[PDB]
């Protein structure tokens, strides 16, 4: 019966809420009310990368923390050498409407996707010397919002058809379709161990998925609007999700609830992209107010402002070694901060 | 700088030259968003002047255009329309012949979208001949779906085609007036709506888009000079 199923669902949700409140022994602010503040950190624009014709919508660091891929909504995927501002590669794209790009951990492949409902995997290392389409993964009935490489063969893409998908580049077929979100998934962050990944959707909900055994392990609510960005804490037991409600939140997988809420009364814009520092003490969130904000992840105190972008900040990402942050905005500029 | 470093800088400079050549084309091409409903006539228009997103490159008067039609998507449009905050115009196609209120609401949240405040809308009222040959018959009454039709007179600034009954002109201009009443309200002058009448078989549609894109660009350039 539909009514009894709805009643059972409501009872289960009430039980989940009660269990979550039971574990709320204290707050992260109370536990970390004695640690010294990180201070007023100040990172300046050490390098501005120009050459993108249109608004940059995605950017991903390489494993070596020297190469940087950036996708612009002009049909261009540019791989830069972040140390020397040099452009290592300029890949034309079949579709000029691109919202995501992923750099493989090995550095031999680069992904992109957008309103073409297709994940294009390009082979950087080829005997022919050029970058060519290695694969065109299709099967998503909607725009691809984010993509992340597990390895040289497996990529997981969250697309605006309320689904994520673990693919298989060799066969070009979906290996596991993660369903359960009621709205378009905007971003997904891979756990460092690659066993799990969390994806936030336009339903004010993030969801943890087991990549091997495809299912939603945990669901996290608390946001009042669409989650635009999700990032995984370096430890891998927590993740920060920013929404277009001028709020980021830190959720612990073990506590299964929000730990801290980063927000300010002077902030009315929406978070577009979120990244964590290597230590996890700093949470860098790009907003719609043309500047990013550095938050104390353990105290909910704003620690800095990465002002300098003339348009909305679309993406920001920390290096694997934590050396420098990169920020791509709609002003067609990539800025590196230290 | 070593030899390989210098050669890498040379590769970067060649990439920059190619990017400049590509910019010479990107800045000279005007992007448009083809929006509408399933029973609107978008497919007929894209078939004229000649899954994912579909790109149609139509050039008239020696200026290239790029019309993008969004397909294989869902009702949640707000999260991909942000990608179109820099296009020249949104060609919004409406079937003038039941679901007219649904299409009128669809015109809102596109006119009133916070990412399209400076985005002009070229409004196409497609398949006007269906309305023409449907309104002579009394089977369907426009006043039945829209009550404020009897208490409405045809505008003085109307240019009916030679051979059009007054009822046809009154109905089509009532639909247009509904759309422009939605458009002008909550409009700060940053973007303008340009209504047109089409029958889905008209070689002039590309010319209308041309003449309207030139007007949009003209007003934006004038605004850059603080002349308007």
């Amino acid at each position, epitope marked *: 019966e539909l009514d009894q199923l709805r009643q059972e669902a409501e009872q289960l949700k009430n039980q989940i809420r009660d269990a979550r409140k039971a574990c709320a022994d204290a707050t992260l602010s109370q536990i970390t009310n004695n640690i010294d503040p990180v201070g007023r950190i100040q990172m300046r624009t050490r390098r501005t990368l120009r050459g993108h014709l249109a608004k940059i919508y995605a950017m991903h660091w390489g494993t070596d923390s020297r190469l940087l891929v950036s996708a612009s909504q002009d049909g261009k995927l540019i791989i830069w050498d972040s140390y*020397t501002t040099n452009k290592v590669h300029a890949i034309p794209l079949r579709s000029s409407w691109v919202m995501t790009c992923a750099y493989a951990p090995s550095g031999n492949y680069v992904a992109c996707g957008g309103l073409d409902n297709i994940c294009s995997i390009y082979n950087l290392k080829t*005997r022919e010397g050029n970058v060519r389409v290695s694969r065109e993964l299709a099967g998503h009935t909607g725009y691809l919002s984010c993509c992340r490489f597990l390895d040289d063969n497996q990529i997981v893409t969250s697309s605006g058809d309320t689904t994520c998908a673990l693919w298989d580049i060799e066969t070009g077929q979906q290996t596991t379709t993660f369903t359960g979100h009621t709205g378009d998934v905007m971003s997904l962050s891979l756990a460092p161990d690659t066993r799990l990944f969390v994806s936030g959707a336009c339903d004010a909900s993030a969801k943890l998925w087991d990549v091997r055994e495809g299912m939603c392990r945990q669901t996290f609510t608390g946001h009042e609007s669409d989650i635009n960005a999700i990032c995984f804490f370096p430890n891998g037991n927590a993740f920060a999700t920013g929404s277009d409600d001028a709020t980021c939140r830190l959720f612990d997988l073990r506590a299964d609830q929000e730990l801290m809420t980063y927000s300010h009364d002077n902030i009315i814009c929406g978070i577009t992209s979120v990244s964590f520092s290597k230590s996890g003490r700093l949470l860098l969130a790009g907003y719609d107010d043309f500047n990013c904000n550095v938050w104390d992840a353990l105290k909910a105190d704003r620690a800095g402002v990465l002002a300098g972008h003339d348009n909305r900040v679309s993406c920001l990402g920390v290096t694997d070694d934590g050396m420098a942050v990169a920020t791509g905005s709609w002003d067609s500029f990539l800025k590196i901060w230290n | 700088l070593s030899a390989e470093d210098k050669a890498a800088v*040379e590769r970067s400079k060649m990439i920059e030259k190619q990017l400049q050549k590509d910019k010479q084309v990107y800045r000279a091409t005007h992007r448009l968003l083809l929006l509408g409903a399933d029973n609107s006539g978008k497919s007929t228009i894209v078939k004229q002047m000649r899954s994912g997103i579909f790109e149609t490159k139509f050039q008239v008067d020696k200026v290239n255009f790029h019309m993008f039609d969004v397909g294989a998507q869902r009702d949640e449009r707000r999260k991909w329309i942000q990608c179109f905050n820099d296009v020249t115009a949104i060609i919004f196609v409406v079937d003038s012949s039941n679901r007219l209120q649904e299409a009128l609401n669809d015109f809102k949240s596109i006119w009133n979208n916070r990412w399209l405040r400076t985005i002009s809308v070229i409004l196409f009222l497609n398949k006007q001949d269906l309305l023409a040959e449907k309104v002579l018959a009394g089977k369907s009454k426009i006043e039945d779906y829209f009550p404020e039709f009897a208490r409405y007179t045809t505008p003085e600034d109307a240019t009916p085609e030679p051979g059009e009954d007054p009822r046809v002109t009154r109905a089509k201009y009532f639909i247009r007036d509904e759309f422009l009443r939605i458009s002008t309200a909550s409009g700060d002058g940053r973007h303008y709506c340009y209504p047109h009448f089409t029958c889905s078989v008209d070689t002039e549609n590309a010319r209308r888009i041309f003449n309207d894109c030139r007007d949009i660009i003209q007003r934006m350039h004038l605004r850059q000079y603080e002349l308007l």
Partner: single-chain antibody
Amino acid sequence: VQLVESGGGLVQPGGSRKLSCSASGFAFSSFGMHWVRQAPEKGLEWVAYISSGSGTIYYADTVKGRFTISRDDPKNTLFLQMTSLRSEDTAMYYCVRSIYYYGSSPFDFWGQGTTLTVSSDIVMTQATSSVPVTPGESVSISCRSSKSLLHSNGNTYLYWFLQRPGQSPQLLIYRMSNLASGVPDRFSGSGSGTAFTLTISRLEAEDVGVYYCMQHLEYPLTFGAGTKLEL
């Protein structure tokens, strides 16, 4: 991905001849191309370099002015025009492709060569001119430099090439520790400024031949004498 080189033969001294190299299988435009010759029963000598886009053109000090290099990207063919020929210019002229970016593998592919029979610099020293080789054992070829090859970038521009009997040289190691594509994992490279060792573990057949060490820190590119491994 193959480069086939033609336009060579018997030339009277003082003559002029155009050496053509036609490429097929890779992007000619994005690849810089070098001409590197090898005199009979001698080592490897760099002759010329035409960069991607014909921007920087470099010539060896011994062929400067007499030789000119050019490329045709639409025709995918690289030309070496040779004027005022000398008897000290007889060699098998090899054409190599080298692309330059971060993580690139310059000098990755060589061609087949053309016989042209005619009727300061960073000196590379290879002390071992010949080394006995037994299959299954390990060997360590040594190379020395006249100046440190470790730039401020942290890259030690040393290249180890292998030339099998009757075959064109094949890239083995680039930047003094980097295994080239298709090269077995047994090969390794190590060393520091003005000292380099290439170690081959579990030496096998089809591995004998002449090993060459080359510098890429600054032009002109100078190779080594060549260490011969034979069974």
